[model samples]
Target: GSSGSSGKGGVWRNTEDEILKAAVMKYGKNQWSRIASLLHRKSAKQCKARWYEWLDPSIKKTEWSGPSSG
Candidate 1:
């Protein structure tokens, strides 16, 4: 979870569908950082983290199974 001021004040946890819907609606996967701001989030990294977690609950930093480093 996030910390500091933005972390509190009832920051609702958006569902996977909701995040995808927002992403497509706002930027269509072009500008995630802007989308994150529109969603009142702190950073795009956080949004990406949440998205990945929703997509694969078993995924972890040490066990990531997506694209390989290039």
Candidate 2:
């Protein structure tokens, strides 16, 4: 059954991750639906969540590596 108004639900595959990364890099983050278009199986919301939660390289890590003291 459909999940919500956004009509998105399911597990993500490795291939989808690759597609998402490529789309985000090419089209940028604000274009969620655009990125989803590249990945037929995924929805815009799903893509956005995945990118922000996991795939986004810009996301900071726990190990705070401050700028080198020059």
Candidate 3:
């Protein structure tokens, strides 16, 4: 949920998976602004947030497991 402008004074929308994946693949992790440029609708911050929060597979999730056996 970005409140930043879409360069049109409008709120930003969610980025597509294809575009996001392609940008990350092409530009690597530290080039968010460049990735944003490729995706004309989102800003750099938005792109970065999306990558870290959703797209990047490096992030680990902690889930609950059943009782452990001795």
Candidate 4:
């Protein structure tokens, strides 16, 4: 069952989230425009935005202790 914001994008759901993760994981960051088509509700930019903003585990939230004095 496919769903969407109709007029625009908003909150993401489990189904869409999973598909995005899978698409990104398998497809990588090369073809976002094509990959985004997987989810009818979202666009290429939105897909990347979602992944970059939240989905990507690598940059989810990192902490830097600090650099040592030279």
Candidate 5:
């Protein structure tokens, strides 16, 4: 029942993800409060959602998800 973009927790783009990484690199991880700050996105927690999920080098991707299932 959810639409896109206008969702309370909007969808994301690679640009945000890219900047999130860049800021983390310039600073360090977990300080995503600043990292999300740099992105200046709509929702702070929303930004954290993406950066937090599957976001560690330790995440050995099983490729369980994605449109690649097609």
Candidate 6:
């Protein structure tokens, strides 16, 4: 599901939001390679390409914001 927007040594752009949603839905979470393959990623490089593009920011930010301010 490469998006055709090449980046860094001409890696296929596999950062389509749909693919990302599918990957997460299929593999649950943090399963980059599995998610990539499930979403029809052509190469491991492509998977890693998207991974670095999308994953770096959410590395350890968690969802909980501590105790509620009630």
* Ranking of candidates on lDDT, top first: 2, 4, 3, 5, 1, 6
Best candidate, TM-score: 4
lDDT tens digits, residue span 1-70, model 1: 6555244332445563476556745675557677676565445665565555454445565554777888
Q: Ten-residue segment with the worst summed lDDT in candidate 4?
A: 1-10
Candidate 3 colliding pairs: none
Error of 2 at 38 (Å): 1.4
| Candidate 6 TM-score to native | 0.34
User: How big is the positional error of residue 30 in model 6, measured in Å on the Cα after superposition?
Assistant: 11
Clashing residue pairs in candidate 1 (N, C-alpha, C atoms within 3 angstroms): none
Task: Show how many residue pairs clash in every candidate, following the order shown.
Answer: 0, 0, 0, 0, 0, 1
Q: For candidate 2, report its TM-score.
A: 0.66
lDDT of 4 by residue, 1-70 (tens): 3455443345688998998888888888777888878887677878888788788777836457556477
Segments of candidate 5 deviating more than 4 angstroms: 1-9, 42-44, 62-70
For candidate 4, list the clashing residue pairs, or say none: none
Clashes of 1: 0
Candidates sorted by TM-score, descending order?
4, 2, 3, 5, 1, 6
Superposed by TM-score, candidate 4 places the C-alpha of residue 40 at a distance from the truth, in angstroms, of: 1.3
Candidate 2 global CA lDDT score: 0.78
Model 6: how far residue 43 lies from native, Å: 3.8
Model 4: residues with Cα > 4 Å off, grouped in runs? 1-9, 60-70
Residue 58, model 5, lDDT = 55
- Candidate 2 wrongly placed segments (more than 4 Å): 1-9, 62-70
TM-score of each: 0.45, 0.66, 0.59, 0.66, 0.55, 0.34
> Model 6: how far is 38 from its true place, Å?
8.5
Q: Write the per-residue lDDT of candidate 2 for residues 1-70, one digit (tens) a residue.
A: 6554355445678998998888888888889987888876677888998788788777876566667678
lDDT of 3 by residue, 1-70 (tens): 4545454333334546578777788888778888777766676787777777777877775457666578
| Candidate 5 per-residue C-alpha lDDT over 1-70 given as tens digits, one digit per residue, 9 for 90 to 100 | 3644324556667887777767766777667666665665445566556656644565677566766644
Score candidate 5 by lDDT: 0.63
Per-residue error for 10 in candidate 6, Å, reads 6.7
User: If both were scored by TM-score, which would come out higher, candidate 5 or candidate 6?
Assistant: 5
Candidate 2, residue 16: the lDDT equals 89
